[PDB]
Amino acid sequence: LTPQELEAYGISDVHDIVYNPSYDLLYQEELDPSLTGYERGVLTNLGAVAVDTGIFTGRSPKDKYIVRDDTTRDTFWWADKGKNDNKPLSPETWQHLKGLVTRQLSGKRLFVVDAFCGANPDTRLSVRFITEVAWQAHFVKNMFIRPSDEELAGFKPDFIVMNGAKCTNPQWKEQGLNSENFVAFNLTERMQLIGGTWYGSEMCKGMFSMMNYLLPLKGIASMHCSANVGEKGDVAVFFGLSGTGKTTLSTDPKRRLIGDDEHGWDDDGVFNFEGGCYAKTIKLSKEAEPEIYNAIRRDALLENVTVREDGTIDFDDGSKTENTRVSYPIYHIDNIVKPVSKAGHATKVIFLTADAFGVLPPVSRLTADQTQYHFLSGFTAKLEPTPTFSACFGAAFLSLHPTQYAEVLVKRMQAAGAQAYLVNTGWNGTGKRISIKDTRAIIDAILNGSLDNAETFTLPMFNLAIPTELPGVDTKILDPRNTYASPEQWQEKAETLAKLFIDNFDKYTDTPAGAALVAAGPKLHHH
Ligand SMILES: Nc1ncnc2c1ncn2[C@@H]1O[C@H](COP(=O)(O)OP(=O)(O)OP(=O)(O)O)[C@@H](O)[C@H]1O
Ligand SMILES: [Mg+2]
Ligand SMILES: [Mn+2]
Ligand SMILES: [Xe]
Numbered sequence: 001l002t003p004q005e006l007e008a009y010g011i012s013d014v015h016d017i018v019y020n021p022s023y024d025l026l027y028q029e030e031l032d033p034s035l036t037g038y039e040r041g042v043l044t045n046l047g048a049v050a051v052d053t054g055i056f057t058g059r060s061p062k063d064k065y066i067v068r069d070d071t072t073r074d075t076f077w078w079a080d081k082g083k084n085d086n087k088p089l090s091p092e093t094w095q096h097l098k099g100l101v102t103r104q105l106s107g108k109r110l111f112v113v114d115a116f117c118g119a120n121p122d123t124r125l126s127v128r129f130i131t132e133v134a135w136q137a138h139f140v141k142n143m144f145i146r147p148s149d150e151e152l153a154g155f156k157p158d159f160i161v162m163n164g165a166k167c168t169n170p171q172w173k174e175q176g177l178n179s180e181n182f183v184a185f186n187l188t189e190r191m192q193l194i195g196g197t198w199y200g201s202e203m204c205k206g207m208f209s210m211m212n213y214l215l216p217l218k219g220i221a222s223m224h225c226s227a228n229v230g231e232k233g234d235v236a237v238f239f240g241l242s243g244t245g246k247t248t249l250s251t252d253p254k255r256r257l258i259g260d261d262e263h264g265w266d267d268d269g270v271f272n273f274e275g276g277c278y279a280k281t282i283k284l285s286k287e288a289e290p291e292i293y294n295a296i297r298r299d300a301l302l303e304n305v306t307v308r309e310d311g312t313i314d315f316d317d318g319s320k321t322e323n324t325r326v327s328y329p330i331y332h333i334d335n336i337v338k339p340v341s342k343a344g345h346a347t348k349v350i351f352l353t354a355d356a357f358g359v360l361p362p363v364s365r366l367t368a369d370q371t372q373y374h375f376l377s378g379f380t381a382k383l384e385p386t387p388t389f390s391a392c393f394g395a396a397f398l399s400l401h402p403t404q405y406a407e408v409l410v411k412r413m414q415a416a417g418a419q420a421y422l423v424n425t426g427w428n429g430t431g432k433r434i435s436i437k438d439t440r441a442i443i444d445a446i447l448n449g450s451l452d453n454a455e456t457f458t459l460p461m462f463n464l465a466i467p468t469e470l471p472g473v474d475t476k477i478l479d480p481r482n483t484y485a486s487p488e489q490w491q492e493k494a495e496t497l498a499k500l501f502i503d504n505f506d507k508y509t510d511t512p513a514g515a516a517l518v519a520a521g522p523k524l525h526h527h
Contacts, residue, residue: 006110009160010102011130016109020152021137023299029134038198039133045311048326050302051135054165056197057304057321059205061396062178063197065089067186076213077401082507084395089184093175094193097184101164101193105130111137114155115144117207118264119271119341123220127207128157136163138301139200142276142327144207145341159190159210165198185209200303200327201278205397208262211273213399221265221408224394226250227258227272229343235270236447237263239393240352241380245425247279248436249352249443251291257336258343265346265412272341277333281305281324284315288436295332302326345416348446351375351393354426354433356385359494361480362434362473363442364422364464365451369520371420372410376402376508376517377501381426387497389504403508421446422464429483429490441472460491461498462522498522 003014018025030041030049041049066076068088079087111131118124129140140161147155168180181196185206192206208224215222225237226246235258238246247260259272260279279292281302286293296302303325306317318324330336337343351374353360366374378390391402398405413420423446425439445451445467456465459480469475481487501522508514 001112006130009130009162010098011110011162012102012106014106014108014110018109018111018137020114021111021134021141023138023141026134026138026141027298030138039135041135042307043311044302044307044313046296046313047298048296048300048302049135050305050307050313052320053200053303054198056181056199058323059199059202059396060181060183060197061085063181063183065177065182065184066399067091067094067184067188069188071188075217076399082391082402084398086399091186094184094186096171096175097169097182097193097195098191100167100169100195101162104164104167105132105162108132113137113140113144114147114152114157115140115275116147116151117144117211117273119145119273120264120266123215123218123264123266125207125210126156126158127161128159129161129163129203131163131165133163133165133198135301136165136198136200136203139327140203142299142301142329143200143204143274143278145275146329159192159207161192161194161203161206163194163203165194165196168196187213204262204274204278208273209397209399211262211264212397212405215264216400216404216408219266219408219411221405221412223263223265223409224261224392224397225263226260227263227270227343227346228252228255229258229337230255230447233344234348234447235343235346236348236350237270237346238350238352239375240425241354241378241388241390241393243280244352244354244380245439246352247277247292248289249425249439251277251289251333252440252443253291253335254444255335255447257330257333259330259341265409269342269344270346272330274330275341276327276329278325278327281315281326282318282322291333295328296326297332300326300328300332345412345418347416347418349413349418349420350443350446351420351422352425353380353422354382355379355424355497356381356383356427357387357493357497358385358427358429358431358483359480359490359497360422360424360462361459361464361466362424362428362438362477363446363451363470364459364466365456366420366422366464367520369517370464371413372406373505373517373520374422375406375409377505377521379501383427387500389500403511403514419452421451424480428477428480434477438473438477442470444472445470461494461524495524495527498524
């Protein structure tokens, strides 16, 4: 608000302050014909501005650091103490990084965006974002919850995010850091600092990481999931790692969207942390994903897409990155929950995975113990298939130990009588990905209760119950062995994958409860 207020954060000599920039002002800022470099936007024929995020086209987990002090020492899940990105940082080194950012933002025109993280007043964070790049302010205006005029009048930040993308750290070698870039958090000062990377989602996932610290410590599940609700009031959540289908599949014309990536689950039900959605656009098909496509219009913000001279978008071009994205406020989707993005208790819990090994079934109904086993496992794979095991389908954002997320999620699911399903949105023996059309039909059958009491057969080794039939889907692909020339091709790959699961899960077996969950995992006692 005032330059004296900004000085309290360490930022000096600010000549122009743009508080709560409007969408109209951000549009004209991005398209200012005198901008240079990665600040510049271009207007597409869809009416949305597109930007280039620079050398970073994704988050940088290797540059993530958390100050280790008496607030975080005994509560945080530290990288140096299972695998995670919560690397410890000294208070002294933090002060050096803070000097870099605050000096970079001193003497600049700054955008200040006030917003909320969390749909519920009783648990939301009030966050103040400070940046010198208009499209970064636009990103957080889209992705966080935009306060009302009454809420702005009494706004009191709980957390400050200072984005110094244009600065770098010359001392990183002597400070033992990964690179000249940094994404750093201090829970004593309640601040996030960013240097070197311009990428906007460091701010979203920085605050998600903070919600992931606070909410489970007070009994509230904090979840990397999309969520929607049917006309009957039945709520579903969709967990999964990146590219597995949370945004694609939750944006469903038969359902009201609650949110697409970050939710809590408290005594009243499931609630969104965010005010927008962050869709993948590589090979985007208007026919397959019409709601996402039709959200790409003025006030959406396209990232890293190829824009031709005539202003048309080549959505198929990944030569800068396969991670092309668009952010938009959530009301760019027609059928959403409003005026607050929340609903009741989830009764369907769907774990999405993209299995590049071609082993897992398109749909399995999970036992209670299998639900815990596969939630802690957090599997997906990419094309030679390369596995990722990321606890809770989102280990990059966990600030507490994985079992603390599992414990509170189990409590919420048991109290609501929820049923869980494992859905392979990836590959089978055809070497092709299951179609969006078939996957949507599988989701329909989960959501309408088709599968809750359906007859099943059991997949060997993983011991997964698979429905014998499903409306709208070719029965043949329900059994993953059927898309190989022989069940023998499937067995070889299944044993490889089972061994990966078993090795990965070992770390959890030093508690009685974790040891007991081994029996719910894949079983392999030869080779
Ligand atoms: N059968 C399928 N189901 C879901 N998505 C599919 C399928 N086949 C291809 N896709 C594509 O896979 C990608 C799914 O990405 P999506 O944006 O839903 O990931 P996400 O789970 O939301 O990840 P993030 O957490 O990174 O946002 C999209 O590009 C989508 O078009
Ligand atoms: Mg998504
Ligand atoms: Mn995500
Ligand atoms: Xe779980």
